[PDB]
Design a protein around this ligand. Structure first.
Ligand SMILES: CC(C)(COP(=O)(O)OP(=O)(O)OC[C@H]1O[C@@H](n2cnc3c(N)ncnc32)[C@H](O)[C@@H]1OP(=O)(O)O)[C@@H](O)C(=O)NCCC(=O)NCCS
Ligand SMILES: [K+]
Ligand SMILES: [K+]
Ligand code: NA
Ligand SMILES: [Zn+2]
Lengths: 129, 347, 392, 347, 348, 347
């Protein structure tokens, strides 16, 4: 609920930060730059959802809530700006491999039971090309 | 100048239940609740009443004040959190019940307690664009609070209806402008399955209700180039009297400016009827040339702001239908047992 | 800066413990450690316990007070240290630093875990990962380590057959351990054809969820002679700790644990030793790949050629001209009680370097008298390294 | 002065289920169903997709075609029969996901299968009145057919979004006029409690669907002074292919006029997304100066009719996002077991 | 003074569903599930069948084997986890369907999968005390496993009835003694509201199933002064094939001793019918003088143990009604779609 | 071998609700109800009380009167319509709660309001056969009546336990014989899904309750060769006072014979606990050598008859635990609001 509310623009729109001192792009957005610390000047930066599979795994026995999705692809995607993210990939388990170009998609990531909040966010999909 | 209210109407069911009657059952101190929430009692619909009937009563009263043939109404919108059907529309029943059918458009609106005013804006657009001559917007609800919960002290039944027109000779009030502030916020919600809602507790206040109400109030006053001193009366969303007053005081409104708008202490929270009912009571008392600020609020996070000016034609119409305050004082008290019976809170 | 040594070590059995209550586990480890230590309960100046679960299963925080209360050692101070799977070593390191200060002479460092009580341990174990940015998206703990294994294979050409060889050694070694969760041997075909948890890992590449407890007794090196004989005293040369990014996707290189490189290097520097001098090592092999990677990061071989090292069998107890790794079953076969594992690793080095009666059947050959332990929290966000020696 | 569509977009999930797969389970003749309903297969949403995600995909594709900054979108309306929350609004999530927040109005519209087109009219009014520069109207749904019922063969998932602007240089299509026919009719409904709806059977056809669709079509053509000969293409509501064609043929439309609008045979009934999706496919193929007749229908008793003309700017934008037909043909078939698993039809 | 089984009867519906068909839907490896639980398939009741019909079919078959007039049955007890009504009793409809009514007592029994054997003990007492001449005890169930869950591979329908008598010349088997071990254990339960049960996972095995089954087996053998060598055949509770064998092997029973009682690999777990059905298959094959150990288990934390001896009258009655193994092999396979349809698992 | 009761015990919760309090809410004449059913008030369980707890309280009281170690109890049977779990047994909790575990057998019994007495028969058999030395049978229920319904006036909480023994000196009462009449009758039932039951109305009366009770009465008196003059006291099933007396009077029992057995007027219908509780009150007052007749009823269509004779040992046991009448008069009245709160009759 409250935690969902804070990182919505990140999960929904992939909005990270850019350090002008470095030039480096960070996602998720950081409050303190790991290199420059207080010196780093931060501006909000909108990432494109485009990225490539850096590594991946297929989850065969997940929590009871992911029963419909089983087996699913979890992966670490290297985005074209540089940041890496962990997310699921909507594709057949035989079609996934390292280096596959993917694109972020707005999906229903979770729900807090029958009565709680629904949590949306990014899930990657392979590009048509 | 182009767009304005030509008629307004309201309805409140007769049954009430005092805070004391609810607290008694749940082992709470009534005076603590009353002081805390700024609420004394609330409206209870009869078992043969619902959001549709309430909407119809209010719609019919608005037509009386407008003094126009309902065949001229080109759109009916009903904003509620408690539409009787999940699929069949309330607005279609209200249209049939006022004989506006069949040459019109309609839709049922959902946006927590902001749904009623959402439709006012829709009617403003359609009349202003010339797509229709008159539009009706209704905000009505038969709210249900969870038996053990605090929302049980406020959740109540009521509705008010507004007819929007283009004719200076028929306008009793004029829209100077509208503004809306909307975000995605999980402060309060109800999932399709559940009969009673779930809330985030203290997260509902500052980060949601105040954030959206005050931003919308500041946005409209920025849009109009206006200050708190320019407005004669104000009405805000009133989940309880506490929130309403804090917001009014925060913006710099005095009791004389906000008193007419605040009905919750003796009516409760009618959700989508709340601000519409408040505004209707302001219009029952208002004089020519009075400027009103009206700001609504909806969970999931939205607020609609209005800047309205009252016209010469106001006193002509007030007595054409029942005054909000008269409906509010024609009442019959019930105990909790009868209340749970009426509400179908019985298993 | 007083020198610190270990006088004793007590360990409960590991795994599906239904009969043993939580209070029986901590008592059972504590009393066994006290007997080996030959100290009276009154001789303990302070207790340091680390628990990752923190009654996530139980619902109980303030576990330290509870433990001291039930132990009957009030009003001695008891403190709880937390760092996921590394909570044990961190409790030990905190215990070492109090002795070193001189504020306490005899301190108990313990670890205990109860995961059988909850129906789904998966949710609690995942707590070590970034909840907002890994768990949230469905990244299970085995899937994170499977993603490490995948990138390692992609970069260094490790095969599934090589990786599976790590498990057969572990299970072979565990048959010589009475406290081990699994006392059976397995083949390469059995490891590879086991039920898959997260590709490429199978059930036989993962450590199990398990209950248990282990406690060490730390004392000042000078005072240690009072309670124990010189030959049964093992000295803590250095206790190092380092940190890394909590999320795997934030690491500069996934195939390596920098926090292990940082901590192990600092430990070698203070001991004035090279990795070639380490006789026995206990590493965090919760997912086998974690076993390979730590062997490289502790400097026993170069990056990439871990697969060759095991497929040959260099790390086996029967092998002579190389370091012996996880002579006890390890997390894979001995079992993995998150809070107690960090302690257990060190208590094994204690037994191995003091040639104790407990590890008679799995006794490694001790040439230089040195042993290292590497405990890891989560995917590597925290690593705590302890280096032990028979000589002060 | 002139109101028109500046951008449109659409989304269809990848999964399908053939009639044959459903019939097989329930002991029915697939060829009989296929012939009767004029339907071959339908769209099935992934278990991680819902009306909100579908609306967001559409909305985002409409923004690409519009080529405007979403900060300029003044209201977002989402018309659905399957909003994820009973109280928290979808339109806010959509607004947040396209970055139109916070300076906007929004509302979730309910009127069976006509809620989508209801919001188009709302955006038409607000833009035309000058209250907003751009408004977005979405029609999306993840419909539910009862397991044993015939609605199981058609009820499907899909969405389309439309952005409305005043500026001629940005418009790809122009509204010549709109008309609506609304009554109170108990042909089909769903009570708040129930998960699956109830219908009146044969009373749904002639007295309800045809009555409202044909009256609205006749009404618009009277308003605009047109004939079936004046229109280049047409799109009607398509609960099944049978009803759609009957209506088209009844008014005198040839196959060449109605073929693009009819998607149900391979898509199914996407309820509030049906005509929006049909209209989007017409726009994908349409040439400059083409006149479209679009008539929607809603179970409660509603129909919205549109008279649209296609502009020069059409060929510029079509390829800026996925064509409706491309989404429709990028598909993966599933059996009935998988389908009931995905849709949560399992208890 | 001497109590024994005068007649027994069993019923299994025709429909089956292979593990492969369920796994396919839920994205699991069938060979893994198949290997683990040693389950290949399970029985599925027709949509016009329920625990009452299954109980009636078995009851009627038991009367055929007994060869006695049902008017003489003085008590009918039905043990189930899936009685059609929450208030109206199944035992009454079964009594009416055998024509035992109205001079009898009856009751519906609940104790997870032990319900069936609980009533056998009740009939033993009433016949032995002389209060009734014949009593019938039935164990039947139309179990339903949660769609996503592992219990979906085993949960099955089946039933078995036993008629208890005191006449020496009518007995086909004789009770040497019974023993029960019962505690309060929250391993598995279902609360009045819920349609599907909730379980404790691994806590169901060692601390619950093994604890009660083995203690009850040990207790009866201490009561009778016997050993595992004294028994010719054995039947234990069969939630999974694995649990059954581990228990048998633990006590020292060989495959030849336990092979006849284990039906779960091709029948599934019929809950209250499980052991009754197993025992019925042992009786279908058993020779005169065969000693049988039967131990049941119920999730609430209970076990019933029996020490049985076969009689020469066995050869005569076996063919009077359908053999358990014949009902088990008369079968029709279905896919998962038809299965969820039949079971009413799909929302309607 | 001769069989008999060695110990008995009972429990009734403290809360009551008068007929007047219920009638008031539903707009009925209380005097009409009171006269009609022969009911003045009914007991209500505390929110922390359930069937199990009542069974445990009554079991524990029975052990006090028996004066024996619970380790000797070889079977515990709990008959109820309201077992807290649908699968986990109540009897196992009761066995644990008195320390009879683990060397025993147990089972939860369902047979409407006759279950309780069905287990008495089961215990009779097991001690009589020599399989156990002591068995316990409990009848207890937490009764729920539908809010609007007449069953709301009677449905109540309570229970009673009986320990059956083999030894002569320890018996306080002796079974002379038992008889049961059972058929298949759809007078009253509840399906697995439903929380509240459905009934036959008038069909439950004469055809079902009277038929089975009376036939079971002649059955036991034919079996024992007795007449109504031979019995000192009697207890029948008491859904209301009207039925109980009409049965007693029909068989020729005088008020002096049936008065002790009838508790419903101030206790209500405790379903499975009804006859056991009545019998326990008879035993609280009975003298040595008193012959009593007890006949139970269960809606599915069964009845259990008992012929019991009281022994010398009663004078010793009665005061060892609370008398039924003392528990019945240890009471606290509540209104209907608190009552629906306690019962979880709130949504
Ligand atoms: C499958 C899983 C859930 C283990 O629990 P499970 O569903 O009951 O499966 P099993 O217990 O049958 O696992 C296979 C066997 O290996 C044992 N085992 C448990 N965890 C194991 C592990 N990490 N590695 C190897 N064997 C393991 C089990 O106890 C079991 O032994 P048994 O067949 O003698 O009873 C696994 O994913 C996990 O817990 N991790
Ligand atoms: K709704
Ligand atoms: K039941
Ligand atoms: Na609607
Ligand atoms: Zn920087």
């Amino acid at each position: 609920v409250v935690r969902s509310w804070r990182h919505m623009k990140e999960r929904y729109n992939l909005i990270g930060t850019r350090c002008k001192t470095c030039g480096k792009v960070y996602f998720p957005s950081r409050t303190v730059c790991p290199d420059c610390r207080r010196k780093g000047e931060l501006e909000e930066f909108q990432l494109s959802g485009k990225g490539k599979i850096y590594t991946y795994s297929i989850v065969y026995a997940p929590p009871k809530e992911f029963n419909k999705l089983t087996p699913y692809v979890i992966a670490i995607v290297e985005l074209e700006e540089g940041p890496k993210v962990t997310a699921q990939v909507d594709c057949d388990i035989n079609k996934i491999s390292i280096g596959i170009p993917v694109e972020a998609a707005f999906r229903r990531i979770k729900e807090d039971g029958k009565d709680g909040i629904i949590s949306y966010g990014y899930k990657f999909v392979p590009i048509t090309e | 100048k182009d767009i304005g209210i030509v008629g307004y109407g309201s309805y409140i069911p007769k049954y009430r239940i005092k805070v004391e009657e609810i607290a008694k059952v749940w082992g709470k101190d009534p005076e603590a609740i009353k002081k805390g929430l700024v609420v004394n009692e609330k409206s209870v619909p009869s078992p043969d009443e619902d959001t549709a009937t309430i909407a119809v009563e209010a719609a019919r009263n608005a037509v009386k004040r407008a003094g126009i043939n309902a065949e001229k109404i080109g759109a009916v919108y009903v904003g509620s959190e408690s539409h009787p059907y999940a699929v069949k529309p309330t607005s279609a029943t209200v249209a049939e019940a006022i004989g506006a059918t069949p040459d019109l458009t309609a839709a049922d609106l959902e946006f927590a307690c902001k749904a009623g005013t959402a439709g006012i804006q829709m009617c403003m657009g359609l009349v202003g664009s010339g797509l229709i001559e008159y539009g009706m917007a209704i905000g009505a609800d038969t709210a249900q609070g969870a038996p053990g919960d605090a929302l049980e002290y406020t959740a109540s039944a009521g509705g008010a209806a507004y007819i929007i027109g283009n004719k200076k000779d028929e306008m009793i009030a004029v829209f100077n402008g509208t503004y809306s502030y909307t975000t995605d916020t999980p402060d309060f919600w109800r999932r399709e399955g559940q009969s009673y809602p779930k809330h985030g507790g203290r997260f509902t206040g500052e980060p949601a209700y105040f954030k959206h109400v005050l931003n919308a109030a500041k946005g409209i006053m920025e849009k109009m180039g206006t200050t708190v001193k320019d407005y004669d009366y104000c009405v805000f969303h009133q989940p309880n009297g506490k929130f309403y007053i804090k917001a009014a005081k925060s913006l710099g409104f005095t009791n004389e400016q906000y008193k007419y708008g605040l009905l919750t202490p003796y009516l409760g929270n009618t959700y989508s009827g709340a601000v519409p009912l408040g505004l209707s009571n302001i219009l029952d008392h208002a004089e020519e040339g009075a400027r009103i600020l009206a700001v609504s609020y909806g969970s999931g996070a939205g607020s609609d702001a209005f800047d309205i000016t009252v016209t010469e034609r106001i006193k002509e119409v007030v007595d054409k239908a029942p005054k909000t305050l008269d409906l509010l004082n024609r009442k019959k008290y019930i105990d909790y047992a009868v209340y749970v019976k009426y509400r179908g809170k019985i298993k | 800066m007083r020198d610190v040594a270990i006088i004793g070590y007590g360990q409960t059995k590991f795994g599906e413990l239904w009969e043993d209550s939580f209070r029986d586990l901590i008592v059972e480890a504590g009393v066994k450690a006290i007997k080996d230590a030959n100290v009276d309960g009154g001789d303990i100046d302070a207790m340091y316990i680390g628990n990752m679960s923190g009654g996530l299963f139980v619902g109980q925080e303030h576990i330290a007070s509870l433990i001291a209360d039930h132990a009957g050692l009030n009003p001695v101070p008891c403190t709880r240290v937390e760092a996921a799977c590394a909570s044990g070593s961190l409790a030990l390191r905190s215990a070492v630093l109090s002795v070193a200060s001189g504020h306490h002479d005899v301190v108990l460092a313990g670890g205990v875990e109860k995961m059988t009580d909850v129906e789904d341990a998966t949710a609690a174990i995942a707590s070590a990962s970034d909840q907002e940015w890994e768990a949230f998206f469905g990244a299970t703990f085995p899937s994170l380590y499977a993603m490490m294994a995948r990138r390692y294979m992609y970069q260094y050409g490790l095969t599934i057959e090589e990786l599976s060889m790590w498990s057969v050694i572990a299970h072979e070694n565990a048959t010589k351990n009475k406290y081990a969760q699994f006392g059976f041997k397995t083949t390469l075909e059995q490891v590879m054809n086991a039920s898959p948890v997260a590709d490429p890992l199978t059930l036989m590449h993962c450590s199990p969820v398990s209950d248990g407890a282990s406690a060490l007794i730390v004392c000042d090196a000078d005072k240690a002679e009072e309670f124990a004989p010189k030959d049964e005293i093992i000295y803590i040369k250095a206790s190092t700790q380092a940190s890394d990014t909590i999320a795997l996707h934030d690491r500069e290189d996934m195939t390596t644990l920098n926090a292990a490189k940082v901590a192990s290097e600092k430990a070698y520097k203070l001991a004035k030793i090279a990795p070639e001098k380490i006789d026995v090592a206990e590493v965090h092999d919760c997912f086998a790949i974690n076993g390979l990677i730590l062997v490289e990061d502790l400097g026993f071989c170069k990056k990439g050629d871990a697969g060759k090292v095991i497929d040959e069998g260099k790390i086996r107890i029967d092998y002579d001209d190389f370091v012996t790794v996880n002579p006890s079953g390890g997390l894979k076969a001995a079992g993995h009680a998150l809070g107690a594992t960090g302690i257990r690793q060190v208590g094994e080095l204690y037994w191995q370097l003091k040639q104790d009666k407990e590890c008679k059947d799995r006794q490694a050959t001790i040439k230089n008298g040195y042993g290292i332990a590497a405990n890891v929290g989560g995917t590597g966000g925290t690593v705590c390294v302890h280096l032990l020696s028979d000589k002060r």
